[PDB]
RNA sequence: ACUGAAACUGUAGUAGAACCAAUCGGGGUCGUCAAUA
């Protein structure tokens, strides 16, 4: 097939990773509107994200300790522009059909989220 | 078309009486962390 696409890299993250993952945008697509909620949540949990590993980050640990062979996962590591919900941010999106309808739970930075 | 003189704003009076630097808190203890293939 050819597409185009995103390439929604995030960085080595964990040992067994082998491949970055790119958004095809040549094909089929949908979209739903982006609540209030929605962008709290992104924001509240990506806080959590950045906060908890503030110390082991500024004492200049390049990965979690817990995990050999791997480094800070982007969003970790980010500015502050990633805990807002800007315009074109590359996002996972956990979907269910209910009603017929594309409902969004919620939005999560990684495939395996906290 | 003769300046009045002489005369302590002083004497007595406690910035004091009452008032708690005090009330609560085991030097304690388990599962998280990372995301993909």
Known sequence: ???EGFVYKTNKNIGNKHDERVFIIDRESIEIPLSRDLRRKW????TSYQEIHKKEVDRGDTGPSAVNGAV???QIIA?????????????????????????????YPVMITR
């Open 1 to 3: 097939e050819q597409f």
């Open 79 to 107: 500015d502050e522009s990633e805990r807002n919900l800007s315009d074109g941010t590359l996002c996972y999106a956990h979907v269910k059909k209910e009603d017929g309808q594309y409902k969004i739970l919620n939005l």
């Open 43 to 46: 924001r509240e949990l990506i």
């Open 72 to 74: 800070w996962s982007r």
